[PDB]
């Protein structure tokens, strides 16, 4: 049931600083008040991140991006628009692929043989008689077979209302693929701002290490699409969210651990002579 959309306004890409963001815990040990120098894959300070947005002026961005050495993904949004990711090497039935999707009731992680659509997306419909927003579309993949790893969580229910205002949620993820392990580090911050990433400091903690054992070179982002009576392949409305992507590089860092065992500051040992 794959559908390829038509209404899309052309727009040049945008680039942004990285500030001091995208640092994670490299070990699970509890250390207190320790200045530790390490060498690992990190996001360089004040690097060049790429900007994509979904606003409605017909902007709906979900291209295929490389996965050279693990990525840093930042999402600024007020409503739940960004729904997940797909990782792979060719994104067709010839090779295995990984899919992480929140379908508003459960979060699903599957490593199968997928046949992905050209423009994968999720959908939400708005009803005026009872003013309800409900999930009504899963136009992601056509077929799935020869699956190896499958995981679904406990059921829940989240809000799908298209609220209007400022971006109240910033979510940061670091994705790595080492020795057959897909490592995901995550962090969440509440904000009240618009149009840009807040400069500051990140404190991403480990989230999951999935033993999937596949080969990953490309990835794509799966968003949500709004449909209502105000509007097929043209009768749709975008939301309001933004996501920034950056690539990790082999660097040397100097991490600082406070008395509570938390990372509070870091120094990138490649930026300026003072560092």
């Amino acid at each position: 049931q794959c559908v390829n959309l038509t209404t899309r306004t052309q727009l040049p890409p945008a680039y942004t600083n990285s500030s001091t963001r995208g640092v994670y815990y490299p070990d699970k040990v509890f250390r207190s008040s320790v200045l530790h120098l390490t060498q690992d894959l990190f996001l360089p300070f004040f690097s060049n991140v790429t900007w994509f947005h979904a606003i409605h002026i017909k902007r709906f961005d979900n291209p295929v991006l490389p996965f050279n050495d693990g990525v840093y993904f930042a999402s600024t949004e007020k409503s739940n628009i960004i729904r997940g990711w797909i990782f792979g090497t060719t994104l067709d039935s010839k090779t295995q692929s990984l899919l992480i999707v929140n379908n508003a009731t459960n979060v699903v992680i599957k490593v199968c043989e997928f046949q992905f659509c050209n423009d994968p997306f999720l959908g939400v419909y708005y009803h005026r008689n009872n003013k309800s927003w409900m999930e009504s579309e899963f136009r992601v993949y056509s077929s799935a077979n020869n699956c190896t790893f499958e995981y679904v969580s406990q059921p829940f229910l989240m809000d799908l209302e298209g609220k209007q205002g400022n971006f109240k949620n910033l979510r940061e993820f670091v994705f790595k693929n080492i020795d057959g392990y897909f490592k995901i580090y995550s962090k969440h911050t509440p904000i009240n701002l618009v149009r840009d990433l807040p400069p500051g400091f990140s404190a991403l903690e480990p989230l999951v290490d999935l033993p999937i054992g596949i080969n990953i070179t490309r990835f794509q982002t799966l968003l949500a699409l709004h449909r209502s009576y105000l509007t097929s392949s043209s009768g749709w409305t975008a939301g309001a969210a933004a996501y920034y992507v950056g690539y990790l590089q082999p660097r040397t860092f100097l991490l600082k651990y406070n008395e509570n065992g938390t990372i509070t500051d870091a120094v990138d040992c490649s930026l300026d002579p003072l560092s």
């Binding site: 020869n146 020795d179 057959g180 054992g213 596949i214």
Partner: protein
Amino acid sequence: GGNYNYLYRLFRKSNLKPFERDISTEIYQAGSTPCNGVEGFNCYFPLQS
């Protein structure tokens, strides 16, 4: 009579990464001519029993 239910991969483009699994059954191209998804001369099935 022979048990033929166990298989192994004979040809690949490059060596595997540690703890990596590959179950694709694409036709391997040994020669310079393209295989076009069919077996023949210098075009072998990657798995054997």
